[PDB]
Structure 1
Amino acid sequence: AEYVRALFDFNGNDEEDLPFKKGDILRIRDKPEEQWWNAEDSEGKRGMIPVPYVEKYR
């Protein structure tokens, strides 16, 4: 799996967004556009995340 680390808190705005906290590790499910990816959190919740707010995590 591909993972990213949150650089900032993301409260989200829209129903489809996946909120997260600074430092969280998120799994990338797919990449429907350049700056918004579909991710999954450790609780199994899914949604859109802003790519500028994350870093590759390996």
Structure 2
Amino acid sequence: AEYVRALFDFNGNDEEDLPFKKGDILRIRDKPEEQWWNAEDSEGKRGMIPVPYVEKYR
């Protein structure tokens, strides 16, 4: 699995999006676009995330 960590907050402004807050660890599910990836949070919610707002989890 591929995990990322949020660097910034994201409100989730389209309904496909997954909102998140800085520090959230998210699992990457799919990369349909270069900068928008499908991700899942610690509650199991899913949606699209802006890649610029996250880093590799390590």
TM-score range, shorter chain: over 0.9
**Gaps in structure 2 of 5+ consecutive residues:** none
Give the deviation of 1:43 after TM superposition.
Answer: 0.4
Distance 1:16 1:4 in 2: 19
Percent identical pairs in the alignment equals 100
Give the deviation of 1:57 after TM superposition.
Answer: 0.5
Give the deviation of 1:44 after TM superposition.
Answer: 0.5
Give the deviation of 1:53 after TM superposition.
Answer: 0.2
Give the deviation of 1:56 after TM superposition.
Answer: 0.4
Give the TM-score of the pair, scaled to structure 1: 0.97
**Gaps in structure 1 of 5+ consecutive residues:** none
Distance 1:34 1:45 in 2: 21
Superposed CA deviations along residues 11-35 of structure 1, whole A, max 9, x for unmatched, are 1101100000000000000100100
Distance 2:44 2:33 in 1: 22
Q: CA RMSD in A?
A: 0.5
Give the deviation of 1:40 after TM superposition.
Answer: 0.3
Give the length in aligned residue pairs: 58
